[PDB]
Symmetry: D2
Subunit: 174 residues, 4 copies
């Protein structure tokens, strides 16, 4: 049994809202200096990558600015995906925003942290996620959250994005 949490229209609005929050918290409207960091979005495959693309694309059209974005494959860091793609310049002294679709256990994000340190040494790392569905197993939290969804362990939350799934949305299932 299915039930929809977020419509296509909700997903798109939520993403633009998140882009605004990123612009605010990372000072992208401000001039630049030691406390305006270079920002890079890295998605966790598969849907995390697409979200990072949608965010980088919203940011650009809202602020005119091109933030680096890419993908961080965590296959080798886990306890047919996109391979790792790091923008030109790398991530040394950058503010990396890790992007994922759903924050559940937090284990995927911990894996991303590990994979990141093989890439280089960011000044800071933040986390943006479309859904936070509780049940953390690690002391992790998202800086930017589309929707907080209370769930039971027997429920599954599924994020659908156009590119992979044909339509945007989020559904809960049992």
């Amino acid at each position: 049994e299915s039930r929809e949490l977020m419509s296509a229209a909700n997903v798109g609005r939520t993403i633009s809202r998140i882009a605004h929050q990123i612009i605010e918290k990372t000072a992208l409207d401000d001039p630049v200096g030691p406390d305006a960091p270079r920002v890079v979005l890295l998605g966790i495959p598969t849907r995390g990558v697409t979200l990072a693309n949608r965010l980088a694309g919203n940011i650009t059209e809202y602020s005119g600015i091109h933030v680096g974005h890419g993908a961080l494959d965590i296959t080798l860091y886990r306890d047919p995906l996109a391979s790792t793609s790091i923008p030109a310049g790398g991530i040394d002294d950058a503010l990396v925003i890790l992007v994922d679709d759903v924050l559940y256990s937090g284990r995927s994000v911990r894996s991303a942290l590990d994979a990141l340190r093989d890439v280089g040494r960011p000044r800071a790392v933040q986390l943006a996620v479309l859904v936070d569905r509780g049940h953390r197993e690690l002391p992790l939290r998202a800086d930017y959250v589309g929707k907080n969804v209370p769930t039971s362990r027997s429920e599954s939350v599924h994020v659908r994005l156009r590119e992979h799934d044909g339509r945007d949305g989020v559904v809960i299932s049992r």
Copy 2:
């Protein structure tokens, strides 16, 4: 003296962001549910109203749709003899509406509690939410904003000055001792 908390750039982006949040939480981007309450913004005079107008218009720039908005004077409800600004309720009233009260700064919460009194003299909303630009802490009542531009730790000896372009000529926030 004084330091800039928010630049003009920071103000417009934050107002845009709150408009986005209002759309989400009250469901303007979707076709309107069976018993969804209409949304009405009521500013607290004078800068609350300036903010409400900007939000209404960002909401329409961003999502094309038109929310009722207006002004709720609270002069007589706070703390001379008379109301210093006009109360303006959009057509259709606020009965069974979702009213969002809008102010520049959330401090003690006493202004919002006044506005709850004033609203009750206008009508009977289904629900009341609160949007502010700055929440500066130091609540004296169990009130909080639904929407907040910036949360700003302050000392009781600091002051927060919000400027909005249509009322003040520039956008900005500064804090002074």
Copy 3:
């Protein structure tokens, strides 16, 4: 169909935890001065009163100190209960902690605020509740919360306390 959210033992622990939080936030371990307020707990009948009693009683045994407690009848302020009982000294310049069992709409708390101002003029008002079950209709929030419980509108949350119900606990129903 029923299901239990909090056992008797959970309820009692949660109450003592709340008493500790009150001691901390209201400076009852500190000497006294213009920023150590006199504290008074007022319960909203029926179960809110009993909770205020249980809290005042936990505070006393934890810190040795006797905080004023009473009841605030909101019958005349609503949109066979306990009548209003205000401790000696009243509430002028006090820190009043309103106590209720469940925070739902917030309308009961708004009614309490109104009833309070007929009693006198506190320096500040806080709110302590055993359960917050979402679905606010007013911009109100509890300073102290036992359990946050996500609910649907069709669910009912019931707080049971020994004195009224025979055993402590909280149950969700449909």
Copy 4:
């Protein structure tokens, strides 16, 4: 110079309060569910351990029950050649346990991230939570504490000094510029 953030009185009460919170969130007051993980506290040396010991013992003073507790040295995992304190894992290990990492102050989060690395070299917990006395903001990693004594806005030029009686002779917290 320096001002008192927390008196000795404030420290003991706050530690007691966190012990209460740990009991709730991990379910020590109830008869233990079918697949409830056992709870183990691991302090980060040296004051983290002092705090963990106090929590373990408040938890037993308050609820009579005994949680595993110990020390996780992170010397080699942060940032010389060697470990400056001892790692001490209680009998039964941490495999499929609920480990609560305990430290005095949560700042950047880099110490906690080190401790996650160190924990992984000890075993495979089912879950890891974090308790700290003071969270002073300025996170550089997406980490947060499950349990916090006090949230303290700070500037990067301020320092927070936690003193706990068994390690330092008095209980207290001060902040200095």
